[PDB]
Amino acid sequence: TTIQVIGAGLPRTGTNSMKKALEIIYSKPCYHMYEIIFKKQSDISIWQQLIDETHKTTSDKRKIYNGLNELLNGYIATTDLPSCSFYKELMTMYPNAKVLLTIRDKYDWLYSLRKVVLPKSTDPWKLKIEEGDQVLGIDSNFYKMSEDSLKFAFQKNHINLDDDEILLECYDEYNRLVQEIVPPERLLIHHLGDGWESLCQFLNVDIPNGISYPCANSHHQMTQLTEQLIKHKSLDDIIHMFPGLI
Ligand SMILES: Nc1ncnc2c1ncn2[C@@H]1O[C@H](COP(=O)(O)O)[C@@H](OP(=O)(O)O)[C@H]1O
Ligand SMILES: CC(C)NC[C@H]1CCc2cc(CO)c([N+](=O)[O-])cc2N1
């Protein structure tokens, strides 16, 4: 198994649905942030060392390639952070892998990000996310790795993440840079709601007969998940309420 598709889209642009869509097409697993959170939290420290390596004055690219290969062993595709921040490196390791850029309205994206991924430091909901994540075993190590991977994607060392305006422009610039960096034939821009048609054509497969395009991971469902984790203090006791998520 080798990487066939590199998902460059940022969190909250439909990466989980694209993960599930690629798993349907290929019948093999696709990486995602939820693979880390719910299945392999030991990957956190690996991603952290890879991101740190990029910050050095002289970066060892083969250390980065080796780490990515270990992390993605057994996977047919990647989506979401932290992997999307390494799309240039994954394109080079896998020159025949195609690139998908999931994209959506920038203002819908910011709202979704503030609800699930990156609340402002002054938002009291931030404390609820953290309390729910604690039930899952997620701690400060994860938040540092995830934040560092977002900053790496945005190619900034210092960033005021509480500034909505700076996030909007980093979002536009990132999506613009992907389309500049990736050769046109090697890239599909998949807008939210685009469904099977353009994706299957791009990947040279047929549209899955009788299987609807996934619609997973809404901020409404994530808000409920956080609340049920806080209430019941157990993922196992609540997962029956969240089918088709993890
Ligand atoms: N098939 C689909 N059609 C429309 N929106 C979708 C979708 N699949 C996922 N989404 C939206 O994409 C966002 C999740 O993206 P990601 O998996 O990268 O975190 C959610 O947005 P909202 O938070 O606005 O509901 C979710 O509703
Ligand atoms: C899945 C839910 C329950 N856990 C919340 C996670 C959700 C995943 C997540 C992702 C990032 C970056 O992609 C950051 N971040 O910007 O530090 C935080 C988080 N928090």
Give one DSSP letter per residue of 17-58, joined into a string: HHHHHHHHHHSS-B--HHHHHHT-TTHHHHHHHHHHHHHSSS
CA torsion, ordered 197, 188, 76, 8, to nearest 10 deg: -130
CB 199 within 8 A of CB 5: no
| Residues near ligand 1 (Cβ within 6 A) | 11-17, 80, 108, 112, 192-193, 213, 215-219
Amino acid letter, residue 66: N
HSE at residue 175, side-chain half, CA atoms within 13 A, is 20
Positive or negative: CA dihedral 125, 129, 147, 21? negative
All residues at 6 or more sequence positions from 37 whose CB lies less than 8 Å from its CB, including other chains: 136, 138, 142
CB 102 within 8 A of CB 81: no
Among the bound ligands, name the one nearest to the CA of residue 120. 2
d(CA 103, CA 164): 18
Domain boundaries, given as residue ranges, for the chain:
1-246
Pair type for strands 98-103 and 77-78: unpaired
Structure tokens at 59: 């970066």
Phi and psi angles of residue 8, each rounded to the nearest 5 degrees, phi first: -95, -5
DSSP annotation of 233: S
Report the CATH superfamily, name and number, of domain 1-246.
Answer: P-loop containing nucleotide triphosphate hydrolases (3.40.50.300)
The residue whose C-alpha atom lies closest to atom 10 belonging to ligand 2 is: 117
Note if the bond before 184 is cis, omega within 30 degrees.
no
- Using the atom order of ligand 1, give the atom closest to the CA of residue 115: 23
Question: In the PDB record, what is the listed experimental method?
Answer: X-ray
Structure tokens at 134: 């604690």
Tallying the residues shown for the chain, one arrives at 246
Helix, strand, or coil (residue 136): coil
Ligand 2 site, residue 129, Cβ cutoff 6 A: yes
Structure tokens at 203: 């990947």
CB 2 within 8 A of CB 77: no
Structure tokens at 80: 């979401």
Amino acid letter, residue 58: T
Which among 5, 144, 3, 115 is positioned nearest to 70, based on CA atoms? 3
d(CA 117, CA 12): 8
d(CA 127, CA 25): 38
d(CA 221, CA 214): 14
All residues at 6 or more sequence positions from 3 whose CB lies less than 8 Å from its CB, including other chains: 72, 75, 76, 77, 78, 90, 93, 94, 97
All residues at 6 or more sequence positions from 12 whose CB lies less than 8 Å from its CB, including other chains: 104, 109, 112, 113, 116, 117, 219
CB 229 within 8 A of CB 132: yes
Name the percent of the chain in helix, strand, coil, to the closest 5. 55, 5, 40
d(CA 224, CA 128): 11
Distance from the CA of 212 to the center of ligand 1, in angstroms? 15
Angle, in degrees to the nearest 10, between helices 43-55 and 61-71: 160
The residue whose C-alpha atom lies closest to atom 11 belonging to ligand 1 is: 14
Strands annotated E in 62-116: 77-78, 98-103
Burial class of residue 82 in the structure, from the number of CB atoms within 10 Å of its CB (0-12 exposed, 13-18 middle, 19+ buried): buried
All residues at 6 or more sequence positions from 180 whose CB lies less than 8 Å from its CB, including other chains: none
Ligand 2 site, residue 11, Cβ cutoff 6 A: yes
Phi and psi angles of residue 181, each rounded to the nearest 5 degrees, phi first: -80, -40
- Using the atom order of ligand 2, give the atom closest to the CA of residue 81: 13
Burial class of residue 179 in the structure, from the number of CB atoms within 10 Å of its CB (0-12 exposed, 13-18 middle, 19+ buried): middle
